[PDB]
Amino acid sequence: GSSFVHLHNHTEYSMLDGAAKITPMLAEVERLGMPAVGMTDHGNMFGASEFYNSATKAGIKPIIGVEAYIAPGSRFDTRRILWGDPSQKADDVSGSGSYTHLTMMAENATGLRNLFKLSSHASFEGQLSKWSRMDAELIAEHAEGIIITTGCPSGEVQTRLRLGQDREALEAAAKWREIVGPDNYFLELMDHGLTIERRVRDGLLEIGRALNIPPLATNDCHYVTRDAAHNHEALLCVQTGKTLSDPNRFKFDGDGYYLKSAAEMRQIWDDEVPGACDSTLLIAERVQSYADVWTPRDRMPVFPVPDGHDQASWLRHEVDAGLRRRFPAGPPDGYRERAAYEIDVICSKGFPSYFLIVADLISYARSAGIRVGPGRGSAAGSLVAYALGITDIDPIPHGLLFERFLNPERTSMPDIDIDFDDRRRGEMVRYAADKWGHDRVAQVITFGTIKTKAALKDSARIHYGQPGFAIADRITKALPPAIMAKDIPLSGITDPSHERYKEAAEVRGLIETDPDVRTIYQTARGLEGLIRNAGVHACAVIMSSEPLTEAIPLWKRPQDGAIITGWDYPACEAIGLLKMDFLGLRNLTIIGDAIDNVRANRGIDLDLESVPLDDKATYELLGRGDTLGVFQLDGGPMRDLLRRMQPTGFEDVVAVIALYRPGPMGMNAHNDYADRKNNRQAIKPIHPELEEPLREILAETYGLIVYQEQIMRIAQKVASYSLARADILRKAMGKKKREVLEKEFEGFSDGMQANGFSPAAIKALWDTILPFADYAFNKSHAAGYGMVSYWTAYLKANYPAEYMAGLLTSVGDDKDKAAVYLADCRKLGITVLPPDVNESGLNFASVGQDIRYGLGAVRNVGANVVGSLLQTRNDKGKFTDFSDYLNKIDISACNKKVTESLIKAGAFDSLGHARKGLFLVHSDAVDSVLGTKKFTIKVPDDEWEDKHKLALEREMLGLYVSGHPLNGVAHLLAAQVDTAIPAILDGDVPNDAQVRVGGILASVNRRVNKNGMPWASAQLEDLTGGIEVMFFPHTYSSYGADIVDDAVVLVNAKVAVRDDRIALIANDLT
Ligand SMILES: CO[C@H]1C[C@H]2C=C[C@H]3[C@H]4O[C@]2(/C(C)=C/[C@@H](C)[C@@H]([C@@H](C)O)OC1=O)[C@@H]3[C@H](O)[C@@H](C)[C@H]4OC(=O)c1ccc[nH]1
Ligand SMILES: [Zn+2]
Ligand SMILES: [Zn+2]
Ligand SMILES: [Zn+2]
């Protein structure tokens, strides 16, 4: 009799329209001492999972419903239906005749199920624009355990009363009331202090009296506490796309839409309308628990097997067949024993079906010619896998362990992730759908969030319009660089305590000394941590043994009709649905293309299965550090390590991946491996006592602890641990729960003691392991990813030109990657030929010892334009001249834009016209010919300057191919430059000597030190080779204007030698 439950609230799932995050919201419900709360979002049930979980923990009853978007007529019909005369425009059916709101709440578990279904049918059958509409027809069929109200102002009853259609309003109420029932109909009354609500008040109370509808108070809250209303206003401007200054923008009137106290709400309503407040309590008593919806169940598909068999038996049979195929003349010793052990584990844990499903997917793919990758993650450690065809890496030779992948003692579920090539990953999703059902397979949702960089850009737009992007850019490009992907929080820039304060000085400078920047920043802080939009998970596919619609809410992406799921992946798996990960890889595609190029350019047919792992040529390449374009080995650091390591065998490759770990660089493990191997450093026993037990386990890695697998074996020998138990020890050591980690010492200590070890030795091993036990790599992953690295390297080493063509084709879109790769080709000696109209195809092509640029990779030119161009040439001649070109081409390819691009690229150079000439003539000529379609056009003799042509060519192609700037100026620099780049590289020059090098600048990189003062690093490449130059914070200020790519410069520097790297440190640029 003294409290109020709120039944109409909006969370942040009503995207860019609600502001109330669930944990803050439930904090307030507690402080105000209310029994229960409700959530009723706008045409979705996407946040039901988070809400149910949080309320149950914090002891509050959860009520879940939806605010539907109903349709004036049929859901299928997509014609706007206004209900009144033109003048009453702003008081009619909302969204210009599209929709009318309704409030629905789930009393029972049954009710919540029906509500999930109704929501799904709406996206499938009733989508108009961005609103998924139910209609009166749907709701009747699926209507048990739901409670409905006469609705907000934007609902039907109230819109009718506003326009004066009073009899019509009464008719609507009686319709909706019959659908649901006498007890499930309530009259909604809200007061916020405006007239539109007040005029109708008499109207509503009248209808209620006539039809005996009980009344209910609600407050339509979109935010938690009053101080926040300012923020709700900036949010609405993000959704609606209009500036704050603009008069006609959507807005709320006055800050009453918040979680009021019980006392506030009783005064406002208790005097005039008796019982509005008391009914809110009566509803809350009626709601029952929704636990059953969330109780976990077994819902994995069951694989069909031939007669006289079960899942177990068929697994055994398929394993046996696989062993024969791999080992034609008989399995080696012990292979049979490992298989039988593993099969029993899988069968005990009841996962036979899972393995068979994964196998079929790989087999179908192999038939169809889709490449599948060697292995990813932890799966390469199972023999059952290698036999079934899933994995192409043999467990037993390399020492990988089964317990890492599946642990006998623990209870969990296996996770296999599979890579398919980038282009044809799509077919796989479809095929899975075909095989298992269209109603049983779906993709999975992601919820996007606003972080620092996003919020700066939303704020600039709402304050300053579409012209605001330029300012937002300047601020965003002046933040300090990010540690993993995560970036400095917005609070951090201005708060002394936070660790990164020193780093952020530059941006703060602007905040304090510019009005506009300061205004953007203040709005931004409010817009952070809020959900912005829906998205779709990059790899996941959910599968079920039953129709998905009986378990979860679903939606259909409008563009392609794909089914997606309502809840996200942690949430789906919790109730027992199967997740599978199909990943895309682009390096798999490059491999396919280079094989095919050889078949045509030369005659060989190549099978990568039967290439030896010991090719001399591969290792010469890896050792010289020429690894641009090789999987995983691209970085500037990793190239230097490979130089020092000088690899000799496949084992050295598996290791280089795992030793550049975020720990090992600083924890200095990678310098050791290199030196121990090359006899510059001496192996060190951990302790004199323990040398001999642990000699073999650590011999491969020259005495260091590199792999997680090495750790599990150590525990076995010294402390006599079962490999299953050693597995638990690794995980616990990782998380560092101190109480457990303490207990861990007891077990380890006791075991080593019984074996007969000293107190001192026991202490030593523990001490060494803890540092090395958060930076230890999974060996299975490095073996699988090492193979792909080796294959890429072999193909580059034996067939140079054919490989580079496959590579350049894949990076057509990204013009920064293309620039890197095109310079590589030049140094290797390959000649890339300029694009051409008659002798080029869509993709780059290997023609003898050269490559011809692909037309599909010019800027602004698309697939469809080039497709048409080629057919014309096929059918109706070569293109003789520019005029002939204009005559023959169809309408689609006549665009002014396409034509100018090709002029600058050099596509018409063969035909013999000068480049500038075509450009000036192009505008008029296109029009004339296009007119006829719906000519001898003269070409002028003028040409752009060398520098400028190259600048423009770079724009369209990514780098210049026809010539190089230094060509033609190379001699000039030579006269003035005291020291050749080759000499200094060779080590001829004494350390710390003045020098005057000259060349072209490339790959300028911007860096900021701890105190925040910007500086730059660049490569001064000349005709042959280059030496790295560093311009320091002070240097960067005085001469910092000219440090931009592709500038011929003269640098005054100082020779600096360190750790086998020779570099220049410079002060003056002319
Ligand atoms: C969730 O975090 C990711 C980390 C990945 C991030 C960076 C690379 C990093 O580990 C990644 C990766 C995919 C790791 C796997 C262990 C995998 C687990 C779930 O199986 O994913 C992760 O752990 C990537 C790469 O494949 C391996 C070889 C690692 O690459 C390097 O460390 C590396 C350094 C230099 C070149 N490669
Ligand atoms: Zn709203
Ligand atoms: Zn509403
Ligand atoms: Zn509402």
Residue numbers in the entry: 7 to 940, 964 to 1099
Article, verbatim:
During DNA replication, the β-clamp interacts with DnaE1, the replicative DNA polymerase termed variously as DnaE, DnaE1, or PolC in different bacteria, greatly enhancing the processivity of the polymerase. However, mycobacteria rely on only one replicative polymerase, DnaE1. We have reported multiple lines of evidence that nargenicin acts as a DNA replication inhibitor in mycobacteria by targeting the essential DnaE1 polymerase, an enzyme identified recently as a highly vulnerable component of the DNA replication machinery in Mtb. Assessment of the antimycobacterial activity of nargenicin, a natural product that targets the replicative DNA polymerase of Staphylococcus aureus, revealed that it is a bactericidal genotoxin that induces a DNA damage response in Mycobacterium tuberculosis (Mtb) and inhibits growth by blocking the replicative DNA polymerase, DnaE1.
To elucidate the mechanism of polymerase inhibition, we determined the structure of full-length Mtb DnaE1 in complex with nargenicin and a DNA substrate by cryo-EM. The structure was determined to a resolution of 2.9 Å with well-defined density for the polymerase active site, DNA, and the bound nargenicin molecule. The cryo-EM structure of Mtb DnaE1 is identical to the previously determined crystal structure with the exception of the oligonucleotide/oligosaccharide binding (OB) domain that was not included in the crystal structure. The OB-domain is flexible as it shows a weaker density in the cryo-EM map when compared to the rest of the molecule. The DNA is bound in a canonical manner between the thumb and fingers domains, as was previously observed for other C-family DNA polymerases. The nargenicin molecule is bound in the polymerase active site and is sandwiched between the last base pair of the DNA duplex, the first base of the template strand, and the fingers domain of the polymerase. Nargenicin occupies both the position of the incoming nucleotide as well as the template base and thus mimics the position of the newly synthesized base pair. To do so, the first unpaired template base is displaced from its position and bumps into Pro668 of an adjacent helix (residues 668 to 673) that becomes disordered. On the protein side, nargenicin occupies a shallow pocket and only makes three direct contacts with the protein: Arg667 and His787 make a hydrogen bond to two oxygens in nargenicin, while Gln638 makes a hydrogen bond with the nitrogen in the pyrrole ring.
